[PDB]
Each structure stands twice: as structure tokens, then as C-alpha cells.
Amino acid sequence: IIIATKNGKVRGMQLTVFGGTVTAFLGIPYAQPPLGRLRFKKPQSLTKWSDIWNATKYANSCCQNIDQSFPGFHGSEMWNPNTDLSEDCLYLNVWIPAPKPKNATVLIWIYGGGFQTGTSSLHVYDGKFLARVERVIVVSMNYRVGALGFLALPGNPEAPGNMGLFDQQLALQWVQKNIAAFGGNPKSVTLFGESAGAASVSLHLLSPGSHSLFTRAILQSGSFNAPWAVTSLYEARNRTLNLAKLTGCSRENETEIIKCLRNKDPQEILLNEAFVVPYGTPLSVNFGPTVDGDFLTDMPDILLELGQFKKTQILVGVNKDEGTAFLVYGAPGFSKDNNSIITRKEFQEGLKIFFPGVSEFGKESILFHYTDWVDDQRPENYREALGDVVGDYNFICPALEFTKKFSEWGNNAFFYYFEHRSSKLPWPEWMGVMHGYEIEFVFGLPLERRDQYTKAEEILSRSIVKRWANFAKYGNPQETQNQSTSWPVFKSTEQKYLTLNTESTRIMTKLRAQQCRFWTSFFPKV
Ligand SMILES: *[C@@H]1O[C@H](CO[C@@H]2O[C@@H](C)[C@@H](O)[C@@H](O)[C@@H]2O)[C@@H](O[C@@H]2O[C@H](CO)[C@@H](O[C@@H]3O[C@H](CO)[C@@H](O)[C@H](O)[C@@H]3O)[C@H](O)[C@H]2NC(C)=O)[C@H](O)[C@H]1NC(C)=O
Ligand SMILES: *[C@@H]1O[C@H](CO[C@@H]2O[C@@H](C)[C@@H](O)[C@@H](O)[C@@H]2O)[C@@H](O[C@@H]2O[C@H](CO)[C@@H](O[C@@H]3O[C@H](CO)[C@@H](O)[C@H](O)[C@@H]3O)[C@H](O)[C@H]2NC(C)=O)[C@H](O)[C@H]1NC(C)=O
Numbered sequence: 001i002i003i004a005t006k007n008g009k010v011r012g013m014q015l016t017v018f019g020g021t022v023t024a025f026l027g028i029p030y031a032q033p034p035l036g037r038l039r040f041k042k043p044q045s046l047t048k049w050s051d052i053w054n055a056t057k058y059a060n061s062c063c064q065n066i067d068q069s070f071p072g073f074h075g076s077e078m079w080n081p082n083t084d085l086s087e088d089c090l091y092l093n094v095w096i097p098a099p100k101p102k103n104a105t106v107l108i109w110i111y112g113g114g115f116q117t118g119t120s121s122l123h124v125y126d127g128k129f130l131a132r133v134e135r136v137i138v139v140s141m142n143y144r145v146g147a148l149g150f151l152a153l154p155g156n157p158e159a160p161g162n163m164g165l166f167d168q169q170l171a172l173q174w175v176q177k178n179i180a181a182f183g184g185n186p187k188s189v190t191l192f193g194e195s196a197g198a199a200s201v202s203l204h205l206l207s208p209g210s211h212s213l214f215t216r217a218i219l220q221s222g223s224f225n226a227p228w229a230v231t232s233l234y235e236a237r238n239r240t241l242n243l244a245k246l247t248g249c250s251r252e253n254e255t256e257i258i259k260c261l262r263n264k265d266p267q268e269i270l271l272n273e274a275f276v277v278p279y280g281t282p283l284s285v286n287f288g289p290t291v292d293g294d295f296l297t298d299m300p301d302i303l304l305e306l307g308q309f310k311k312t313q314i315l316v317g318v319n320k321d322e323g324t325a326f327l328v329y330g331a332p333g334f335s336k337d338n339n340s341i342i343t344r345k346e347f348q349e350g351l352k353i354f355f356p357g358v359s360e361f362g363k364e365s366i367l368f369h370y371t372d373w374v375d376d377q378r379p380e381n382y383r384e385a386l387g388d389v390v391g392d393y394n395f396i397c398p399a400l401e402f403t404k405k406f407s408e409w410g411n412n413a414f415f416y417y418f419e420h421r422s423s424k425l426p427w428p429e430w431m432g433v434m435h436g437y438e439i440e441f442v443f444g445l446p447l448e449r450r451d452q453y454t455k456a457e458e459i460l461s462r463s464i465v466k467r468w469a470n471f472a473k474y475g476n477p478q479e480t481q482n483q484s485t486s487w488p489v490f491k492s493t494e495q496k497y498l499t500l501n502t503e504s505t506r507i508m509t510k511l512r513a514q515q516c517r518f519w520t521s522f523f524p525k526v
């Protein structure tokens with residue numbers, strides 16, 4: 001099973017899925033390793049090789065810091081890298097249906113992890129299911145994260161910023177030059193990602209050099225207009241400089257500072273990334289996408305507002321309890337190991353955590369718009385309130401505002417609201433249907449009867465997997481056979497969305513409307 005690419009011969013491996021076969025190429029290089037004098041640079045192209053690459057195991061994950069807050073806990077460790085960390089990490093994976101397809105729609109997966117963490121080799125990013133069940137080709141790439149991939153000295157090509165985004169873009173390139181040899185159709189490519197991956201996807205909608213690299217886009221719990229997604233040029237400098245002071249690399253020739261950080265061990269760089277911002281939150285994106293003038297040609301809010309994006313269809317959505325995950329990473333009174341009923345003092349104490357550099361009055365207005373209870377006796381009030389505040393501010397309202405503005409330029413948009421809690425979900429019940437726990441359903445993991453999921457979950461995964469592929473294949477995320485509910489387009493007048501649950505899939509209007517007026521209109525004034 002050897003495939004010839006533009007750079008040389010690659011050999012994959014044969015997997016048995018659901019009494020059928022998927023062919024997997026794991027860990028194909030897509031760029032010169034960003035090492036030595038190549039650290040912090042845009043990813044250079046790849047020289048031809050005269051052999052057969054063995055793409056038969058996942059490559060190295062990119063250098064990154066690891067969630068060590070909950071050691072031994074599957075709920076947090078299922079997200080930490082599962083391969084060697086190295087700077088030599090610019091690789092990608094291809095799953096093709098067997099027998100080899102002819103002109104298959106390609107799905108390209110971009111992982112999240114706050115632009116600091118993440119790897120494609122994760123179990124819940126395994127694309128052999130979608131290859132098997134829907135007959136699509138699934139690609140996912142590793143891209144640089146944290147300072148190694150997003151450190152920004154605006155202007156200087158030695159550290160121009162947005163390198164991790166250019167990694168991704170060189171991967172879409174590779175698919176464009178090479179996927180046709182795997183049976184894929186480069187004119188039918190749907191990007192999809194989650195969290196920072198979904199923010200990443202929304203940025204390729206804006207970046208003119210990605211316009212011709214994909215057809216459509218699916219955004220899961222993330223968009224570039226979310227408060228954590230874009231770092232300013234102000235902060236990107238102060239963060240770059242503080243990394244330099246922290247490593248003794250402070251020079252005056254801006255170029256010499258980068259040469260200094262290049263002769264430092266990858267670890268010394270990882271530990272100092274924590275402290276470059278004087279007060280962090282659980283959602284601190286220390287080194288993220290900046291307005292660089294190469295990938296991103298302008299402030300993305302202005303680009304979005306004025307219609308300067310790829311005109312195509314989008315699939316956009318969010319989970320019911322986006323924000324709860326972050327409450328146990330700092331919010332006082334919370335724990336994954338009790339029900340975290342917090343008092344009013346504790347709730348206020350938690351806004352200082354999540355809105356650190358916000359004025360007194362701004363913290364006071366969050367408390368105001370979230371503590372007019374219908375029943376003031378309910379002791380979960382402040383615990384649920386703080387969750388929604390974090391989820392509404394960081395995820396739900398930016399995603400709805402992205403869909404409104406994008407749909408305003410005449411393109412079909414589809415919004416979902418994922419409200420099912422995995423029966424296998426390892427976090428406690430008070431945290432709900434958390435950030436990132438739709439991915440297993442999107443990737444069709446509940447389709448494995450062995451994995452101890454319930455039958456209603458196999459059916460829901462089955463419906464979602466069909467809806468995603470139909471949207472990828474046909475720009476229309478319907479499930480047309482098993483009597484499903486029809487998913488209406490999100491028009492900015494009526495703002496209709498589809499709920500995704502194991503029971504009654506329903507059509508509803510104007511998600512979190514009262515909350516999002518606060519976050520999208522009022523709160524940005526403070
Ligand atoms: C890339 O892969 C090929 C093929 O092997 C395949 O992939 C591997 C990752 C494994 O899962 C294999 O089971 C699978 O078939 C590698 O080719 C192998 O190279 C070795 C090392 O030289 C060969 O050994 C020689 O064989 C004979 C004895 O049979 C003598 O002439 C020599 O003394 C010598 O021992 C071997 O035959 C060959 N094939 C197999 C099936 O093992 C290839 O090296 C690999 N490249 C890598 C990993 O860089
Ligand atoms: C839910 O659990 C949280 C988290 O506490 C941690 O996890 C628990 C499951 C236990 O294993 C705890 O031992 C562990 O720390 C509890 O938050 C903690 O509450 C205690 C008691 O209210 C706080 O202790 C106080 O701390 C301050 C400042 O240091 C002083 O006034 C006192 O000396 C006193 O000891 C503690 O700050 C707080 N811990 C953290 C890490 O936030 C929570 O009370 C508990 N609640 C419910 C309702 O289940």
C-alpha cells in the first residue's frame with residue numbers, strides 16, 4: 001500500500017474498522033523541522049526524499065506545557081500529548097477509506113488547546129471512523145503552539161508571529177498538492193476544528209492566502225472573535241520582551257533577542273511562558289494569533305464587520321456548559337470532587353479570577369446581569385452562575401456573534417447547540433456537557449459498541465457523523481433518510497439553531513439572547 005506524493009513515496013498501514021478496512025498514514029512530514037536557526041520562523045518547504053517514508057505511527061507532538069493539575073485523572077489527561085514532545089513536530093495524518101476512494105470529500109481537523117497545547121495524535125481525534133463510516137478522507141496536522149509557534153516581534157521575519165497558523169496553512173497546501181493521489185478531491189475540503197482549532201478555522205476564513213485551500217468550514221466551540229483568541233500587538237510585544245527578560249535574552253537589537261532565544265533549550269522557554277502576563281486566567285492564551293500583516297492583514301473584528309472573508313457555508317455551534325471546565329482550575333470553592341456549591345462571596349471572588357484586569361464596576365455588572373434568580377433559595381445559584389458567565393463570555397456569545405455577522409453577507413450558516421452529557425464523561429455531574437466533549441461524538445467514537453457507550457449515544461453519533469459529512473460533501477448538514485429533524489439555516493433575523501441530544505432534536509430561536517446582549521453590546525464598553 002505505497003502512495004507517491006510530490007515529495008516521495010510514503011507507506012501506510014492497514015486497519016480493520018467495523019468489519020471493513022481503513023488505510024492510515026500516520027505522521028507524514030509537511031515542512032522542514034523548525035529547528036536550529038528555523039525556530040520561530042515560518043515553516044520552510046520540504047525537500048524531496050528518494051526512499052519510502054513509513055507513515056505507520058503518529059509523529060512527535062510539538063513542545064508544550066502539560067496540564068498537571070489533576071494527575072492520574074483521565075478527564076484532564078485524555079487531553080495531554082500522547083507522543084514525544086519535540087520541536088521536530090510538523091507532521092500530519094491521512095485516513096483514506098479502503099478500497100481507495102475516487103474523488104472523496106476531505107475533512108481537515110485542527111485541534112484546540114488555547115493555542116498553547118494540543119496534538120492530532122489524541123484518541124478522540126482518530127479519523128478512521130469517519131473514513132470507514134462516511135467514506136471521507138480525514139486529515140489532521142500538528143502545528144506549533146505557545147511561544148514556539150506564536151511568539152511575535154511584529155515585522156521581524158525571525159519572529160513574525162502566527163507561525164502555528166502558517167504551519168496549518170502549509171498543511172492545507174500539502175492536501176492541495178497531494179490529496180488527489182490518495183483518492184481525495186482538493187476541490188471538496190472542509191476545515192473543522194474545536195476551541196482554538198475553531199478559532200484557527202475562522203481565521204483561515206479571513207486570511208487571503210487560505211482562501212483557495214479549502215471549500216467550507218465547521219467551527220466547534222470557538223471563533224477568532226472570542227476574547228482569548230487574538231493577542232494584541234501591544235501585549236504580544238510586552239509578552240515577547242518579558243520572555244526575554246525572564247531568560248536574560250534582553251538585548252536592544254530586536255534581531256539579537258531572537259537569536260538569543262534560539263540558543264535556549266526548548267524547556268527553559270516553556271516554563272517562562274507562564275509569567276509573561278502578570279495576571280493570568282484559566283483561559284490565558286499567553287502566545288496566540290496576532291495581527292501580523294502576513295496571515296492576518298487587519299484586526300479581524302473589522303474584517304468580519306466589513307465582509308472581508310471567504311464566501312462559503314459554515315457549520316457553527318457550542319455546548320451547553322462551555323465554561324464549567326475552567327471553574328476547577330482556580331475559582332475558589334470549586335472542585336471536581338464535590339458539588340462546588342459556592343456562596344455569594346465565593347462567586348464574586350471568582351470574577352476577580354476570570355476578569356482580573358477588569359474595573360470594580362465591570363465585575364459589578366456581571367454580578368448584576370447573572371444574579372436575578374427566579375428562586376433565591378437554590379444553593380447551586382452562584383455555582384451555575386459562574387459557569388455560565390465563563391461559558392457565555394468566552395464561547396457562546398462570540399460564536400453566535402460570528403454566525404450573525406458572517407451570515408449577513410449571504411452565506412448559508414448552520415448553528416447547533418450540543419446538550420448531551422457523555423455517559424462515559426469522567427468529570428462530575430455539576431459540570432454538565434463540557435467544553436470539548438462533543439468531539440467524541442463528532443468523530444464517531446460512540447459507534448464502537450465495545451467502548452461502553454449507550455445505544456442512544458451510538459444513534460446520536462450516527463446522526464451527527466452523517467450531518468457533518470453531508471455538510472462537508474454538500475454544504476448542507478441534513479440527515480435525509482432516518483426521518484431526522486431538518487436543520488434550518490441561521491438567518492440573522494430569526495436566528496434558528498438545532499439542538500443535538502439523545503432524545504428530541506429540536507428547532508429553537510435566538511440562543512442565550514439576554515445574556516449575549518450584555519456580553520456583545522454592553523460589556524465591551526467597560
Ligand atoms: C519501513 O517498513 C519496512 C516494512 O516493514 C513494515 O513496517 C514495519 C514498521 C513493521 O510493522 C513490519 O512488520 C512491516 O512489514 C521495513 O523493511 C524491513 O527492514 C528490515 C531491516 O533491515 C529487513 O530485514 C532484513 O531481512 C532479511 C531477513 O528476512 C535479511 O536479508 C537481512 O539481514 C535483514 O534482517 C526486513 O526484511 C524488512 N521487512 C519486514 C517485513 O520486516 C523498513 O526497514 C522500514 N523502515 C523504517 C522503519 O525506517
Ligand atoms: C469543595 O472542595 C473545595 C476544594 O477543597 C479541596 O478539595 C476538597 C474535595 C478537599 O479535599 C479539600 O481539603 C481540598 O482543599 C473546598 O474549598 C476549600 O474550602 C475550605 C473550607 O471552606 C477552605 O479552607 C479555608 O481557607 C482559608 C484560606 O486559606 C482560611 O479561611 C481557612 O484556614 C480555611 O482552611 C479552602 O480555602 C478551600 N480550598 C480551595 C483550594 O479552594 C470547598 O469548601 C468544598 N465545598 C463543598 C461545599 O463541598
Ligand SMILES: *[C@@H]1O[C@H](CO[C@@H]2O[C@@H](C)[C@@H](O)[C@@H](O)[C@@H]2O)[C@@H](O[C@@H]2O[C@H](CO)[C@@H](O)[C@H](O)[C@H]2NC(C)=O)[C@H](O)[C@H]1NC(C)=O
Pocket residue numbers: 238242243245246275276277278
Ligand atoms: C508589561 O510588562 C511589565 C514587565 O512584567 C514584569 O516582568 C516580567 C518579566 C514578568 O515576570 C511579569 O510578571 C512582571 O510583571 C509589567 O510590569 C510589572 O507590573 C506589575 C503589575 O502590573 C508589577 O507588580 C511589577 O513589579 C512590574 N515589573 C516591572 C519589571 O516593571 C507591566 O505590568 C506590563 N504592563 C503594561 C501595562 O504594559
Ligand SMILES: CN(C)CCNc1cc(-c2ccncc2)c(-c2cccc3ccccc23)nn1
Pocket residue numbers: 067079111112113114115116117118194195196228282283284285325326329435436
Ligand atoms: C480544546 N480541547 C483541548 C478541549 C479540552 N480542554 C481544554 C482545557 C484547557 C485548559 C487546560 C489547563 N488549564 C486551563 C484550561 C484549555 C485552554 C488552555 C489554555 C488557554 C485556553 C484559552 C481559551 C480556551 C481554552 C484554553 N483548552 N481546552
Ligand SMILES: *[C@@H]1O[C@H](CO[C@@H]2O[C@@H](C)[C@@H](O)[C@@H](O)[C@@H]2O)[C@@H](O)[C@H](O)[C@H]1NC(C)=O
Pocket residue numbers: 102103185187188473
Ligand atoms: C473530481 O471532481 C471534480 C469536480 O469537483 C466537483 O466540484 C467541487 C466544487 C465539489 O463540490 C465536488 O464534490 C464536485 O465533484 C472534477 O472537475 C475532476 O475532474 C474530478 N476528478 C476525478 C479524478 O474524479
Ligand SMILES: *[C@@H]1O[C@H](CO)[C@@H](O)[C@H](O)[C@H]1NC(C)=O
Pocket residue numbers: 253254255256
Ligand atoms: C542586528 O543584528 C543582525 C545580525 O548581525 C544584523 O543583521 C542586523 O542588521 C542588526 N540590526 C541592528 C539594527 O542593529
Ligand SMILES: *[C@@H]1O[C@H](CO)[C@@H](O)[C@H](O)[C@H]1NC(C)=O
Pocket residue numbers: 462463466479481482
Ligand atoms: C438509519 O437506521 C438504520 C437502521 O438500523 C441504521 O443502520 C443506519 O445507520 C441509520 N443511519 C443514520 C444516519 O442514522
